[PDB]
Amino acid sequence: AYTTFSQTKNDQLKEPMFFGQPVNVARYDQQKYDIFEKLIEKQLSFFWRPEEVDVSRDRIDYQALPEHEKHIFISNLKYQTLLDSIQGRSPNVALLPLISIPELETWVETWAFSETIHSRSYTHIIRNIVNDPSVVFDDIVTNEQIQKRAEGISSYYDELIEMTSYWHLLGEGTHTVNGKTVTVSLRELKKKLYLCLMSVNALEAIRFYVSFACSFAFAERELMEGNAKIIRLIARDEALHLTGTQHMLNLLRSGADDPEMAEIAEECKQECYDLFVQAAQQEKDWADYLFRDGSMIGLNKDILCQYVEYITNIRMQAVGLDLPFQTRSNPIPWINTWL
């Protein structure tokens, strides 16, 4: 069913965002949703290379950090690398096969490209602060606390792609596979898409900004400044990324794109809320691991958990969800200088 160039001459302005006729001609003179066009332009205007940031000073800082402050910084840096390793590949393998409008197709691909620059910047930092980078990269796969968030986040992607395959190959209806019962449903497939986008919105808008705060806390003490300068560029990119998933969710929810999405977006509003909750608690439990051996000036388990609730409320309000925590003010306002 899927084609890398659909031969039908369709009006791309009336196609839905997802599950419509796959995009054939890539044109940029017209947009159904002009937000994705200007996200492309903003992201292109922000193009930066990791190597233009001097991280050479961060080796001295890192060796001077006490062992627990090393553990805080390295554990936070490894989580960032795991996160954008998944964000490097997943938007292309998962969203691209489903897009039916050209402006969104290009943004998803530009979005994923920006994540490879983020991934390369993490290598740049690691190479310049530790003696053996292999130890860092290998722990990312074999860290018990890291594998928890890793397999949960990827499942929203994998379940979408595996069901994408059943749909492109069979279509709707109940099918038989070696005697097994396979019932492919379009509503169930787009149910897995909406949830996936909700998960990715929490990843970029909530989980990553927890790490930014941890990275800038070192910057506030005038430590790991090369690292912080890079995170400043990552953060400015992340703002575009969460904005994109925000409009995608709101447009599908409003029924203007797909009216069938409106009913599905309400039917799964509970599990969307519950997803953001589990993500927030997972980040709280992560702070217990970060400060397992102690804390540092400007950041501890308590202060960070307040920033989790603070940012979680904001992001959930922008996607039309109810707030799960007390409406409180910013516990670390110094972070706004870096954003």
Residues that bind Fe ion (CB under 5 A): 84, 115, 118, 204, 238, 241
Token pair recorded at residue 303: 């202060």
Task: Return the one option of a copy of itself, Fe ion, none that residue 116 interacts with (CB less than 5 to 8 A, by type).
Answer: a copy of itself
Task: Return the one option of Fe ion, a copy of itself, none that residue 94 interacts with (CB less than 5 to 8 A, by type).
Answer: a copy of itself
25 binds a copy of itself (CB under 8 A): yes
User: Please, which residue, 118 or 232, has the CB nearer to Fe ion?
Assistant: 118
Least Å from the CB of residue 335 to a copy of itself = 26
Alpha carbon distance, N-terminus to C-terminus of the chain = 44
Collapse the DSSP code of 25 into the 3-class scheme (helix H, G, I; strand E, B; otherwise coil) and give the result: coil
User: Please, which residue, 209 or 310, has the CB nearer to Fe ion?
Assistant: 209
Q: Is 175 annotated as a binding residue?
A: no
Least Å from the CB of residue 94 to Fe ion = 14
Least Å from the CB of residue 72 to a copy of itself = 20
Burial classification of residue 179, based on how many CB atoms lie within 10 Å of its CB (0-12 exposed, 13-18 middle, 19 or more buried): exposed
Token pair recorded at residue 24: 């054939």
Interface pick for a copy of itself out of 38, 57, 113, 318 (rule CB under 8 A): 113
Q: Is 172 annotated as a binding residue?
A: no
Residue 122: active-site member: yes
What span, in angstroms and rounded, lies between the C-alpha atoms of 117 and 115? 5
Which DSSP string do the residues of 104-153 spell out, in sequence order?
Answer: HHHHHHHHHHHHHHHHHHHHHHHHHH-S-HHHHHHHHHS-HHHHHHHHHH
What span, in angstroms and rounded, lies between the C-alpha atoms of 199 and 279? 9
What span, in angstroms and rounded, lies between the C-alpha atoms of 137 and 65? 20
User: Please, which residue, 81 or 313, has the CB nearer to a copy of itself?
Assistant: 81
46 binds a copy of itself (CB under 8 A): no
Task: Return the one option of Fe ion, a copy of itself, none that residue 204 interacts with (CB less than 5 to 8 A, by type).
Answer: Fe ion
185 binds a copy of itself (CB under 8 A): no
7 binds a copy of itself (CB under 8 A): yes
Q: Other CB atoms closer than 10 Å to residue 49's CB: what's the count?
A: 11
Task: Return the one option of Fe ion, a copy of itself, none that residue 241 interacts with (CB less than 5 to 8 A, by type).
Answer: Fe ion
Least Å from the CB of residue 101 to a copy of itself = 13
Q: Is 188 annotated as a binding residue?
A: no
Strand partners for 174: 183
What are the angstrom distances between the C-alpha of 235 and each of 106, 170, 204, 211?
21, 41, 10, 10
Token pair recorded at residue 112: 């994923």
What span, in angstroms and rounded, lies between the C-alpha atoms of 139 and 27? 44
Q: Is 118 annotated as a binding residue?
A: yes
Q: What's the sign of the alpha-carbon dihedral 98, 1, 154, 139?
A: negative
27 binds a copy of itself (CB under 8 A): yes
Among residues 236, 158, 235, 153, the alpha carbon closest in space to that of 201 is found at 153
Of the residues 122, 156, 307, 310, only one is catalytic, namely 122
103 binds a copy of itself (CB under 8 A): no
- Interface residues with a copy of itself (CB under 8 A)? 2-5, 7-9, 23-29, 40, 44, 47, 49, 81-82, 84-86, 88-90, 92-94, 96-97, 105-106, 109-110, 112-113, 116, 119-120, 123-124, 126-127, 133-134, 137-138, 140-142, 147, 150-151, 153-154, 157-158, 161-162, 165-166, 168-170, 175-179
Q: Which residues are annotated as a binding site for Fe cation?
A: 84, 115, 118, 204, 238, 241
